[PDB]
Ligand binder design. Structure first.
Ligand SMILES: O=C(CCc1ccc(O)cc1)N[C@@H]1[C@@H](O)[C@H](O)[C@@H](CO)O[C@@H]1O
Ligand SMILES: O=C(CCc1ccc(O)cc1)N[C@@H]1[C@@H](O)[C@H](O)[C@@H](CO)O[C@@H]1O
Lengths: 364, 364
C-alpha cells in the first residue's frame, strides 16, 4: 500500500517514468476543505496524487481541476487511463449524482466530467465511506489487514466463522465501517455467503435520530441548542465533542475547539478526557443499534481521527467503558451485541484513495 | 405466477403431469405454525406445494418432512432436483445456520438436510424476509409488479431513475421491504450501480430501540409495561396494536386481540381505528428513519396483513396521515424522506415461496 503526494508538476514528471508506463486508474478523494487526486497502479498498490484546495467550497470546482490535469498531462499518459473513480463527502445516487453536501455547495455530476479521466462504462462517483469500505477490502486483498487494523475486543461469532486470529483478515461476514471524523461516516461491507463475495453498501447512520438510554436530559439539553432532535452525528463529530466539553466544564472554563479538546485529553486533562468518553459513548450507541439492525461479524473504526486518538483506545479503562456501552442494548440478553468483533485503524492510510482504485477494478 | 397448495399424495400425482417434466427447485416456506414445501418450475412461475403442521414447534421436524417427501416420491421426480432453498422465521448466518427463533425451538442446519432435496453448492437457508425480498424481485422480473403492488405515494427520486411509471417495476434502486405482521420483518434489496444487479440483504430493523418524536410519555408507558426499552416491533406488531387499543379506551371498553382490533376497524369502530393509526404512526417512523439510514428508492409493505387491511390504506385521510408521518424526520428539511416511493402489496401472494425459487436461480 503506497501513496505519494506530489505537486502537480512532480506528478507530471513521475507519470513519464518507466514504472508508470502501464494502464492507469484516475482517482480522487474529495473532502470539504481539500481533494487529493492522482493516478493509481498495481500485490502492492501504488498511488501518486496531488492536493487541491476546495477554496470556492463548491463541488463543481472539481471540473476545473480535471481540465487542468488533462491540459497539463501528456496525451501519452492520459491515454493509459482505464478507469476513473472519485469519492465525495455526501450521499451519491447511481454512482453518478452526489449531493446535497453539508460543507460544499452544488451537485457532483459524473456526466459533466471529462471522459479522458472518466472513461464511459468504467467510471463512478462514490460516497467517501463507500470508497473507504472498498479501501478496507483492498487492505484485506493485499494480505495486510493486521498491519492497519487492531482488535479492540473479539466478538463471540469470530471463532465460529474463522479459524485465523481476529484482525488478521476482514472475515467472511458483514463488516460495518464507521468513520467518526468531520462527519460521522458509515458503510456496510455486506457478505453474500452464496457466492462468497463482499459488496459495499453506502449508509447514512450518522443522520438517524438518537434513541435514548438513561440520557433523556442530556439529549434534551442538546435538542434545545440545535432546535432539532439530535442525531448521532450531533453527538459524534467536532461540534459534538465541543458540546460534551461545554457540558463537562459548565462555564468554569471557556470553550475550546474539538482539536484542542483532543490535545488536552492526550495530556491527561480530566475535563477533556471526560468529553472524549462522552463522544465515544454515543459512537458505541451507533454501534450497538447497528449491531442489531445489520448483524455484522465485525465493526471497524477508521480515519485519521481514530489513528491519531490511539492514546485514548490504548487506555484499558477507556476501552472497557466503550465495550460496556457497546453491550448496552436490550437485545444483548440474546447476545446480539456480544457477537461482534470491534477493530480500529491503528496505522495511517488513506482508505478512500485505495478504495476508488479497488472499485475501478470491478468496473474494468 | 401461480401456487397450488395440494395434499402430499396429490402433490406426487401433480408432479407426473407432463407440464412438470422439467428440472425442479425444492422450496420451503417455514412459519411458526405451518410450513409449505414443494417444487417450482418456470415469465411463468408454477409452484405446487403441500402443507405441514409445525406441531413439535421445533425447527428440526423439517428433516422428517423432508425424509417423508423423498420416500413418498419417484426417482424420476427427485432426479430432476437442481436446487433446494427454504426460508425460516429468524436470523440466518452463512445461508446455512438458522435461528435461534422467537417462535420455534432448535437450529436449522443445512448440513443435516438430505442432498436429494438440497444439492450441495445449489442450496440455501434464507431468512423469511430475505426470501420475501427475492420474491419481490421475481414479481418484478415477471413484469407483473403493478398487479401485486399499488403506489401509496410517489417519491421525488423515482422519475429521475425510472421512465416507467411507479409501481410498474421494482426500479433500478434500493428497495426496503417491510413486513408488519405478527413480527416486524425487514430486508433491503440493494441495487449495485456498478453491475446493475440487485442483491438481498437481511435486516433486523424491528429490534432497534425506538427514537422519540413528541411521544416520550407514550413510550415510557410501554417501557413500564414491558420492563424493556421499547423497539419498533413492540409498537408495530400484534402485541403493539393491542397496546395502542388499550391506551385509547383506558379501561372503558374490553381489551381486544390484534385480529379483533383489525376487524373492528374495518367495520368502522372509532377506537379500533384510532389504534390502527397509532400502529401506522410507528410503522412510518421505521420508514422515515430507515429512509435516511439506507437511502432507498422504494419502500414496499408486504404480507397478508397488508393486503387484508387494504381498507385502511385506501382511505385518503389515513394515507395522508401516514405520508405526513413518513416525512416526520429532521432530515426532511433536505428532502430525504420525500425521495422515497412507498408501495403496498394489494393482492395475495406467497412472496417467500417465489423468493426461494428466485434465490435458487442465482445458485444454479
Ligand atoms: O452530510 C450527510 C447527511 C446529508 C446532508 C446533506 C446536506 C446537508 O446540508 C446536511 C446533511 N452525510 C455525510 C456522509 O455522506 C458522509 O459519509 C459522512 C462522512 O464524511 O459525513 C456526513 O455524514
Ligand atoms: O428473531 C428476530 C430477532 C431476534 C429475536 C430473538 C429472540 C426473541 O425472543 C425475539 C427476537 N427477528 C425476526 C426476523 O428474523 C424475522 O424476519 C421477523 C419476521 O418474521 O420476525 C422476527 O422479528
Amino acid at each position: 500500500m503506497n501513496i505519494k503526494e506530489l505537486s502537480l508538476h512532480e506528478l507530471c514528471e513521475e507519470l513519464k517514468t518507466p514504472a508508470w508506463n502501464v494502464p492507469l486508474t484516475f482517482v480522487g478523494d474529495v473532502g470539504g476543505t481539500s481533494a487529493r487526486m492522482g493516478f493509481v497502479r498495481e500485490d502492492s498498490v501504488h498511488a501518486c496524487v496531488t492536493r487541491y484546495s476546495m477554496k470556492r467550497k463548491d463541488i463543481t470546482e472539481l471540473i476545473e481541476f480535471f481540465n487542468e490535469i488533462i491540459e497539463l498531462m501528456p496525451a501519452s499518459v492520459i491515454k493509459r487511463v482505464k478507469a476513473g473513480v472519485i469519492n465525495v463527502p455526501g450521499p451519491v445516487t447511481g454512482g453518478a449524482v452526489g449531493g446535497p453536501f453539508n460543507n460544499l455547495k452544488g451537485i457532483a455530476r459524473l456526466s459533466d466530467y471529462p471522459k479522458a479521466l472518466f472513461p464511459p462504462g468504467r467510471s463512478a462517483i462514490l460516497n467517501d465511506l463507500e470508497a473507504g469500505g472498498f479501501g478496507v477490502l483492498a487492505v484485506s486483498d493485499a494480505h495486510v489487514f493486521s498491519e492497519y487494523f487492531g482488535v479492540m475486543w473479539e466478538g463471540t461469532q469470530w471463532r465460529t466463522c474463522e479459524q485465523e486470529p481476529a484482525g488478521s483478515v476482514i472475515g467472511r461476514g458483514r463488516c460495518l465501517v464507521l468513520a467518526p471524523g468531520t462527519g460521522l461516516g458509515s458503510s456496510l461491507i455486506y457478505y453474500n455467503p452464496m457466492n462468497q463475495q463482499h459488496i459495499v453498501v453506502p449508509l447514512e447512520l450518522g443522520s438517524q435520530t438518537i434513541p435514548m438510554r438513561k440520557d433523556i436530559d442530556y439529549i434534551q439539553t442538546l435538542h434545545a441548542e440545535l432546535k432539532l432532535l439530535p442525531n448521532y452525528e450531533n453527538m459524534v463529530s467536532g461540534a459534538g465533542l465541543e458540546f460534551h466539553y461545554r457540558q463537562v466544564v459548565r462555564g468554569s472554563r471557556p470553550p475550546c475547539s474539538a482539536g484542542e479538546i483532543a490535545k488536552l485529553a492526550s495530556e491527561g486533562d480530566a475535563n477533556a478526557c471526560k468529553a472524549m468518553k462522552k463522544y465515544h459513548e454515543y459512537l458505541m450507541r451507533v454501534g450497538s443499534e447497528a449491531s442489531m439492525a445489520l448483524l455484522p461479524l465485525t465493526i471497524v473504526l477508521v480515519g485519521d481521527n481514530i489513528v491519531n486518538n490511539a492514546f485514548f483506545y490504548r487506555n484499558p479503562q477507556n476501552l472497557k467503558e466503550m465495550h460496556r456501552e457497546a453491550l448496552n442494548h436490550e437485545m444483548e440478553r440474546f447476545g446480539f451485541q456480544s457477537r461482534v468483533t470491534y477493530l480500529r485503524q491503528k496505522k495511517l492510510l488513506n482508505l478512500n484513495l485505495m478504495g476508488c482504485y479497488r472499485c475501478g477494478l470491478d468496473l474494468s
